[PDB]
Every structure is written in C-alpha cells, then in structure tokens.
Ligand binder design. Structure first.
Ligand code: IAW
Lengths: 195, 198
C-alpha cells in the first residue's frame, strides 16, 4: 500500500527521489524548514521511498491508532545527522543503538528545524553540507522524559507494561520527542542544506 | 493474519494459553526442551498470543523472505529470562536495550540459544522466589548470519564497501551455531513460555 505521491520504482523497494523545486510537494517541505531555517541554503530535497520501512511503520501506526482509540498519534518532526549516517537511515531508519540522551536512550526528533540545524546534529561535511530528515513520528501519548530511560515510562505503576508512546522535554510545549522502538519513525524527506 | 488455531481472544489483543500434555503442540515443545534439559521438569507450557508482536514479526519475516529470496530465515530457539522480565516480554517482546552482557559476547543484542540447556542456566532463567525458571521458545529471523564480535550494535555488513547491506543476525560459530544475536525489534516472536523447576 505505497502512498499515491510516491513515483514508480520499476518493481524495486528502495529509491531516493529528488523533488522538483517549485512543485507543491517541494514547496510544502521547504516551507516547514524555512519556518525556522530561512537563513540556510537548500541544495536539494529528496523523497525517501523505502517500501519495507513504510510497511513496518504503517503497521505500528495502525496498532497505536487501535491502542490509543484515536488517529492523533503522528507528528512531522526533524532529525539532524552526519553524512556517514544518511545511507543507514535511508535504508534502515532510526536506531536507538547508534550526543546527549538527557530524556532517555532513544532517537531524538525536534519540533523546529532550527534545533536539528545545530552542527552537533546536522554535522557539516568537508563542503559545509548539512543533512536533516523530515520524519513521520508516532509520538502518540507522551510524558516528560528523564535520563536513563530505555523505554517510555508506564502510564500507571499499577500496569507497568502499559507504556507512554514517547517522551518529551516539556508536555505543555514540546520541542523534542524521543522514541524507543524501531519503526516508530519513518524518514520521509532528506534536506541537504548549508548555513 | 492471526493463526486459525489460536484461541478466539474476543477482540482482546493478548492471551496466554495453557497447553495440555499429550497434545502434539505441547509434546513437540517438551521434546525440544528435554533433548538437552532432561534433569529439569516442566510445570506448564503457555502459547503466547500477542496480536501486535505477531503482526510486526510476520511483516519482518515476509520482508526477509523477499530480500533473501528463500524461506530458510526462521529458527525456533530458546531464551532464558528472570521472572521480573516475563510480563514485559509477553507484551512487548525482546528489547536489546534491556539485554544482559553475555558471558561470551558476539555483539550487543538479544541472545537466543539452539539448546534449552544453555537457556536453562540460572544466569539466564533465574529461579524466582518459588524456584520457578522461565524459558521462551522463540521464532527468530536468523536469516543469513556470520560469526559475531563483541563490539557489534547491528549485524555487520556482508560487504565492507556496502556498509548498509547487513547480515540478518550473528552467531558464535557459523559451522556449528549454538547461539544467535539479533539487533532489531520484531525479529523474534515469543511463541511459548516454559515454566519449569528442578
Ligand atoms: C536534547 O538532546 C537532543 C539530542 C538530539 C537531538 C535533539 C536534542 S534535537 C535534534 N534534531 N536532530 C537530532 N536531535
């Protein structure tokens, strides 16, 4: 069940598709980035078409939608990473086993591209090229994180196995989310940019 | 896609089903266990019916079967654990982030034994305060594997010039595997819980 906006992959399961500047899709993703990173220079935006990662993610989304009894479990967030991690993320997505982990040992996603645009995350390569993903994240029901978490806390100590879906720095006004399971995040776009 | 011989869970997503001795399903597991654990005695064998873990695992299995272009990707292995871990595993499966360092480490992942005798060690299946030991019987997507190394946080690449094309798992010995390490969620389905005692 591959999304309508994907382009044909000639019976293959993985493609990075460079977006056409000035078309609706490129404009939408560029605007999400320029909301907070208007001082940067965008080289390109690529759509990540990874059928396997999409499949596993959509299964987790369906499960979380059932568990939480609503379809408000997904957020579009940003993730800055170094060039050497990009091939791994494109093919395998986010891996907590691979910076600070102040809110738990998971994968960190920013509400604002400006946070992910920090050199500590989107490490500039030899040429100053920086890499940021636009990510579909199953944040679901979240709570405040803390150092040393390996999974989200339980929603009630009385049922230790019924967990929050993610944690954040601040429940009232979140700026970051941490997820602790594979296939809770789908890397949808890769932005290549410079300061 | 839930298996047709599972008990009806009346829209519930999770059930543990106590098996009857003399049923083929119980006897095959008891035989697999007693092959190497004949000094122990089984209290009970429970079938783990976890709809969400099954769905995610079967998706991974289909993907691995496609990628590897054969259906030799799944092994039935053992996993000894402490009583405090059983509720988590039943609900959420095997979390590498919680895994102990193995006394012989072939990587930082979840370990599964070919032989029940390995998993039966008190170091894994820690006897609880009532002397009950706990061992899972696990469908594991071992796929294509290589000898592991203690530094691994993912399986190694098949080819160093293509670092993202990975082995599916690692082992202690490719010619005579006795343990497998997996590094991803939903690569192992806890199918049965064996409760046993000395
Ligand atoms: C407080 O810890 C982190 C750690 C990593 C991280 C953030 C915050 S925001 C962001 N964007 N990409 C990566 N990250």
């Amino acid at each position: 069940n591959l999304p309508e906006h994907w382009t044909d992959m000639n019976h293959q399961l993985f493609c990075m598709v460079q977006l056409e500047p000035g078309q609706s899709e490129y404009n939408t993703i560029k605007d999400k980035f320029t909301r907070t990173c208007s001082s940067y220079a965008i080289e390109k935006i690529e759509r990540i078409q990874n059928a396997f990662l999409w499949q596993s993610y959509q299964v987790k989304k369906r499960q979380m939608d059932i568990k939480n009894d609503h379809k408000n479990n997904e957020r579009l967030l940003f993730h800055g990473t170094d060039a050497d991690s990009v091939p791994y993320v494109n093919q395998h997505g986010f891996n907590r086993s691979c910076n600070a982990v102040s809110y738990g040992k998971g994968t960190y996603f920013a509400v604002d591209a400006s946070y992910s645009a920090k050199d500590t995350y989107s490490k500039p390569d030899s040429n100053g090229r920086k890499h940021m993903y636009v990510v579909r994240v199953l944040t679901g029901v979240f709570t405040k994180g803390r150092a040393g978490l390996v999974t989200p806390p339980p929603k009630n100590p009385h049922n230790p196995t019924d967990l929050f879906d993610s944690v954040t720095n601040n429940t009232r006004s979140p700026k970051l989310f941490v997820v602790f399971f594979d296939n809770q995040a789908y890397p949808e776009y890769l932005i290549t940019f410079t300061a």
